[PDB]
Amino acid sequence: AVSKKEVLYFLSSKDAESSTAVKSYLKSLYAGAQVEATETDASELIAQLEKKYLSAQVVEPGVHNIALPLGESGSAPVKRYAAELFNLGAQAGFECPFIEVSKKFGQETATSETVKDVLNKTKSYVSADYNAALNEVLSSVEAEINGPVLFDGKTEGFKKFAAKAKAVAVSRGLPADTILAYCAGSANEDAADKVSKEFFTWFESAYTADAAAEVKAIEAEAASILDRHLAKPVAQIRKEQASAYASLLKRAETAKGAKWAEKYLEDVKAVQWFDASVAEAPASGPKVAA
Amino acid sequence: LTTFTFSGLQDAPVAALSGSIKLNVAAKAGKAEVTVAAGAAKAATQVSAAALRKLSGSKISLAEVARISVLHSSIQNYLLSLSNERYQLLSQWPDFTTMYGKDFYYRAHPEDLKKFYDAADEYYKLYETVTEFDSLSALASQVVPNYAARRRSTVHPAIGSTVADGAFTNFLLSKQ
Amino acid sequence: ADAKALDELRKPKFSSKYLIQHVSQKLIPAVK
């Protein structure tokens, strides 16, 4: 339940079983047990892989405690949803999403020479409608420059490429000046913070647009799934769902000795308890210990 | 919420807003005279200034007890609020039972009466399957895994295309 | 019996967290 690197990730989380294992470990430490030494080993690849597989154990049970704001009109449900995903990323050891995906860009193209190669390497992280708009600008300046546009910063091909990529990004709706002013910085705080307040209006626009796109896809998927399901007769629905339940339950009763399967069956028993305790008192809810 | 909060007996509500419960505070500089009045039973006390500041010393920290999860219950509530939208248009279906009598049987063409009885059987199919609300849970369990795999992103749980394109705008238009 | 707890009920159920933990426990020693 605790492996002494799991419990360091679970300190800053507010999830239920994570705080339960944290409280059990802290309670065992209060009865005179000793803190294990933190391993000063497992070099950068193993460290980043273990970070990836330790933050996911904070992320994914914390995703299931975030209610999707489906069918909710307005700004506040989508802002609540994106704020809860932000706080979940902060609890899991992520940075800001801007800083984290810019770190992904800097890690991917630490080795590139030409700008079409940074477009071939950050292909997976930018939208293809933006990648195509940058590729056509790159071919446009490549026709006139008669050289591969290198990733330099001061070459005339790069300057006349960036002066057009700023134009296409202004066309997309991304204010490139305020984003560059925030991520570059300024001296006087009363003129750096007046553009940080514009970067944060763009940033709030950006993450509510992304969370609303996720909510719209889940709405469309649930409506498509229901309207495929409402066309069946009831006996087909009952036998299909009973077969799916029985197969997924046999998959967990097949593998024994694993921790996930016995947690799966404990959770099935907990759903049966929830049904039983609602059955014994339906106008008050499930029986919570108080 | 935070560890130190700074509210209580200052710019507080002086009266209730609806007539379902009556509440008045006769606040002096030091303490307050509150009489809460709700129907049959009404209560009254003198709440200190050092009590409304001492109330947020411990936190309640409310949390939802769900059958499976809160995400699953949000998806199931959406499925239920869509099945209500389909039920509302199975609610405006015309009563075919007012045309079952034998004066409607023998006046009608045989194939049109067979089509009419098939339409009645079809409505019973649609109404029997739109009110199978014990299927919505296993329908919501089909939206959960793909969404929850999209939130196990290697970048961030909250990352999307707009923030990643804006960060590529910052990254590409900086000095390499 | 009934009336289980409060922290035992706040936990989301069919999240993975133990397939991720199983993949960590079968992967991180195998890559060390």
């Binding site: 996911a56 939208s127 469309a220 998927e221 498509s224 309207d227 | 369990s141 992103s153 | -």
Partner: peptide
Amino acid sequence: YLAPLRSDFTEEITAPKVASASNLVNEWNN
């Protein structure tokens, strides 16, 4: 009510693939 447990990551950043509108409301009005 239970779902298949998956342990895999999303290495790309993609728009979330909105699904097409079904004709079930139009077919039930028909």
